[PDB]
Amino acid sequence: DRGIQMLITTVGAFAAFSLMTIAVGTDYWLYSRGVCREEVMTHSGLWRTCCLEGAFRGVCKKIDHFPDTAEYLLRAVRASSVFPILSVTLLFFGGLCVAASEFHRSRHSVILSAGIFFVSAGLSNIIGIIVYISANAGSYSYGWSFYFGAFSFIIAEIVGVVAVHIYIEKHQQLRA
Amino acid sequence: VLKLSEQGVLDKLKSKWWYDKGSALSLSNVAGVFY
Amino acid sequence: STKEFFRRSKIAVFEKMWTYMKSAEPSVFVRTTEEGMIRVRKSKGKYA
Numbered sequence: 001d002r003g004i005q006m007l008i009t010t011v012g013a014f015a016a017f018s019l020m021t022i023a024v025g026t027d028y029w030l031y032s033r034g035v036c037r038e039e040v041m042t043h044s045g046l047w048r049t050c051c052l053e054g055a056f057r058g059v060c061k062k063i064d065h066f067p068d069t070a071e072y073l074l075r076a077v078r079a080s081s082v083f084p085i086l087s088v089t090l091l092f093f094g095g096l097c098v099a100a101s102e103f104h105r106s107r108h109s110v111i112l113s114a115g116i117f118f119v120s121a122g123l124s125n126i127i128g129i130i131v132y133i134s135a136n137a138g139s140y141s142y143g144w145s146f147y148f149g150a151f152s153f154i155i156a157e158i159v160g161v162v163a164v165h166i167y168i169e170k171h172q173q174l175r176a
Numbered sequence: 177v178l179k180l181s182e183q184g185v186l187d188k189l190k191s192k193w194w195y196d197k198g199s200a201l202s203l204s205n206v207a208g209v210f211y
Numbered sequence: 212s213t214k215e216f217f218r219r220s221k222i223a224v225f226e227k228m229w230t231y232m233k234s235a236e237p238s239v240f241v242r243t244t245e246e247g248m249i250r251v252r253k254s255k256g257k258y259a
Contacts, residue, residue: 127211130203130207130210130211133203133204134203134204134207137202137203137204138204184221187221187222191221191222191223195223
């Protein structure tokens, strides 16, 4: 099953990287009732919150993150969205190592290094979601952007399981 | 005062100067254990 | 007197309440206090 496992990793790495990039870019993370500049039903994201109906529909303004060190650090972290953009960087590198495995089969640590990057991105993504929920709290519904980010985390970890599975199998075959 | 009340002047002045002026545990409670 | 109060009101909230009550169908109005009491009791919290 070495061929299909490698195909599963390649499809997953593309799918995981695409969904995180869509989730960060798409501005439909949370359906809130705020203002665009009276309060109207709006759809929020990581940088901008934009209205869903009314005269100002379609146009909006960058989210002003800034309105005691504990809340200052939390506000700064959620302002820059470092963790979700960090997970995007790790996923992109993970795809590079997966792709580079075919071009250079001499080294064995390449596929394992891909596996660590996929799981490291998942850890980075879950911190961002916890920080995002914590910062936003400090009625609402979650749009398909939030579920796109969460779903990619499941895909990212599943590929990480398959990636190191191949490394163990290939090293087990060589040694024994 | 009766004229101003019957003509809606007092009502308009009031509306102008007053109105027109204008659970489960949270993740923040357990955010330390997740970090 | 309450219907007359809402009809002749110019306060935003009560004007909105009257605009709703005048158009509501079936009539939200009643003929007796007992009738309104029974209507709130039998409407399962859908009548005020």
